[PDB]
Each structure stands twice: as C-alpha cells, then as structure tokens.
Amino acid sequence: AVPFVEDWDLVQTLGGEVQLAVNRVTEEAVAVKIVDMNIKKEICINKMLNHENVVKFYGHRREGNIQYLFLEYCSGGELFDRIEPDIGMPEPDAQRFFHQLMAGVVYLHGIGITHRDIKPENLLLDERDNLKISDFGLATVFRYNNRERLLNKMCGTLPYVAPELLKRREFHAEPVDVWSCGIVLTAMLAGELPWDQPSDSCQEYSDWKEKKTYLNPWKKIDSAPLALLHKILVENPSARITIPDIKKDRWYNKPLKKGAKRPRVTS
Ligand SMILES: N#Cc1cnc(NC(=O)Nc2cc(-c3ccccc3)[nH]n2)cn1
C-alpha cells in the first residue's frame, strides 16, 4: 500500500549473524537472524510461538541459500550483561527475572516445546526490562497428540545441562529445562556458575551433593532462594521439583520488589 514500507536498513551487529534492522519508513526496530546454509525446525517452532516472555517471530524470507529470520529486537540486551561477575544482582531483580523466566517456560512446556539451551545469553530484555526467551535453534517438540516422547540427544551448554543428560540414554524433557533455570537463578544471585558440568568427577558438583553450602557460590545466596535451589538442583530428575511446585515455593512468593517507579509530585 505505502511505498518503501518493506525496506529495512541493517544498522549494527547484535550477536550465522544477528543484525539490528530499522524500517526505512516507520523506523520500527527488529532483529534479523541471517543463516548461511536445524533452521527448518527453528522457523517451524517459531511459527507456533506467541507469549509476552518469548522473543516474537515476525516472519522469514529466503534469498537463495540464505535464510532471514525477522525477530523481536530487545533494547535491554542479554540478561548475561546484568550479572556482575562474582556478585550477581539485587535479589528483587533476580526474583522478577525468575518469575518471567518461569512464565515463558510454562508457556513452552504447555504447547509441548522444550528450549534445551536456557542460559543468560539466550534471555533477552526489552525497553522495560521484560525477559524474553530467545533462540529456538536447539528447541524440539517433546509432546505431540498428548503423547510424551523421551529425549536422547545431547543438546545444550555443559555448565547448564542436567546430570541425567550425561548419565542416562533417555530422559524426560521438562526436568532438563527446570535444572537450567536453577543454574540461571544461581548465576543471577552469585555472579558465578557452580560447576563446569554436573558429573561425580567434578569436585564442585560433589560438594553440592554433600550439602557443603558454606562454599562458593552457595555462601553468597540467602537461605530462602537457596532452599529453592536445593529443590531444583536435585540429581534424580523424577525427584526434582516441577514448575507448579516452584510457584508454591516460599522465596518465589516472597514480597521483595517494588514496581517501576512512576512519575510523582508533592503538595
Ligand atoms: N536467535 C535469536 C535471536 C537473537 N536476538 C534477538 N533479538 C535481539 O534484540 N538480540 C539482541 C539485542 C542485543 C543488544 C546488545 C547490546 C545493547 C542492546 C541490545 N543483543 N542481542 C532475537 N532472536
């Protein structure tokens, strides 16, 4: 209808490659994922998605052997850059980001999708610091026609992967995403990852199973969120807390965080 409304200028590299695109007419900002030929499954999964804590998918264009993915631009950047090394962030900010992460994950599991690579690099923030789950490149459908299929593929990032992925041939999808959410929560509250990987050979992982919480990173975390981490970072995935029970947790429901300060005057 309106000329040049389909034209986007690529103005900067955000993170294949991810570039910030600005509309020539409306000045609307979107993120364009350029993939030089996993991607067929990524587009298919992105077409199913519609939630306030999941990166929006606007559409895709194919120019020969190159795939263009038009995705939500999040001006707040990555959650990763809000974590101060060896410190973390204020507990009320981490609680709010954790609430929004749980809302995103509940939505994905509800439509039978597992992300499989939850980590602060894949959690983006909008202009109002709302968390958005990003990159469905490793995501897969674990429930179809109300039938659950057990996973067996090695996917993810070692410091965030659940121990069953390294020890068992097959495993349920949902406890794997719950575990990575617990590692994200640890990182937000301590500014450090507890272990290189969740194996008996890793001293830090053995110390946690022996409840040595007087050591780092656990010593930096208050007893209320630490009690929640004791229920998430459980080696047996069948005994691990589920998201309905995380929503009933005492720290999860603890009042800590004030709303965004809103302009006010006196007298
Ligand atoms: N896969 C994927 C993906 C990657 N990025 C997306 N959106 C986005 O806005 N990414 C982004 C934005 C920034 C950024 C960096 C510094 C300052 C402000 C924003 N980094 N990365 C959307 N989907």
Side-chain angles (χ1 to χ4, degrees), residues 1-16 18-35 37-39 41-60 64 66-166 168 170-199 201-218 220-260 263 265-267:
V2 173
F4 330 123
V5 78
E6 287 177 352
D7 292 316
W8 304 80
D9 303 316
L10 304 181
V11 302
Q12 75 156 119
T13 296
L14 299 175
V18 178
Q19 285 193 67
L20 166 63
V22 173
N23 193 276
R24 176 184 161 170
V25 172
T26 68
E27 290 177 60
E28 286 165 301
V30 304
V32 172
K33 190 171 178 173
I34 301 154
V35 178
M37 287 160 76
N38 190 299
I39 195 55
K41 198 184 205 180
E42 183 169 351
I43 294 156
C44 179
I45 282 163
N46 267 289
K47 284 159 109 169
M48 301 169 69
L49 310 177
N50 183 40
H51 192 265
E52 54 270 25
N53 297 115
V54 175
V55 164
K56 280 172 191 176
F57 177 75
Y58 302 120
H60 70 290
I66 306 125
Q67 275 280 8
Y68 295 92
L69 267 74
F70 287 80
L71 303 150
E72 194 174 348
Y73 169 65
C74 304
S75 61
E78 303 174 9
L79 178 64
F80 181 87
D81 296 311
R82 302 298 181 93
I83 302 167
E84 192 186 340
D86 208 55
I87 295 294
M89 73 174 65
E91 197 177 299
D93 294 2
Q95 190 200 50
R96 178 178 168 275
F97 290 139
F98 190 73
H99 288 157
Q100 292 174 2
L101 172 61
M102 287 299 101
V105 176
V106 167
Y107 167 77
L108 294 175
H109 291 177
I111 59 165
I113 297 172
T114 173
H115 183 278
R116 305 205 286 187
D117 202 20
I118 299 168
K119 54 182 183 183
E121 300 90 329
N122 286 333
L123 301 175
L124 307 174
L125 301 173
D126 72 1
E127 60 286 346
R128 287 178 181 178
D129 273 353
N130 290 305
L131 179 150
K132 316 272 179 157
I133 302 174
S134 79
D135 196 343
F136 288 85
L138 300 181
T140 196
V141 174
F142 72 91
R143 197 197 303 113
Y144 197 82
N145 287 334
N146 204 44
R147 275 295 290 175
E148 185 187 2
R149 70 162 181 104
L150 302 166
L151 304 185
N152 57 64
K153 201 183 278 172
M154 304 290 255
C155 298
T157 306
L158 278 174
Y160 301 89
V161 298
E164 59 273 22
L165 186 136
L166 309 174
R168 310 301 181 177
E170 293 182 298
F171 42 86
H172 289 279
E174 295 165 286
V176 174
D177 284 333
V178 166
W179 179 280
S180 56
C181 289
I183 303 293
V184 166
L185 179 58
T186 301
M188 293 196 288
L189 295 172
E192 84 180 289
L193 295 170
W195 41 71
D196 290 341
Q197 54 183 70
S199 61
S201 62
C202 188
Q203 187 57 52
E204 292 79 0
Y205 186 63
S206 292
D207 287 341
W208 168 254
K209 294 203 289 184
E210 286 169 28
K211 300 204 176 71
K212 302 186 183 177
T213 52
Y214 49 88
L215 296 174
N216 282 328
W218 321 109
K220 295 183 252 175
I221 305 179
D222 181 75
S223 62
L226 183 56
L228 173 55
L229 289 166
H230 275 290
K231 293 180 289 182
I232 298 175
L233 303 176
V234 165
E235 188 168 79
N236 177 357
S238 298
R240 192 169 307 148
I241 196 178
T242 64
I243 301 163
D245 286 334
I246 288 169
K247 285 179 173 180
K248 298 174 190 154
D249 171 82
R250 184 170 171 149
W251 178 75
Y252 193 90
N253 289 292
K254 187 175 174 178
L256 297 169
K257 183 79 153 153
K258 302 272 167 190
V265 294
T266 299
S267 287

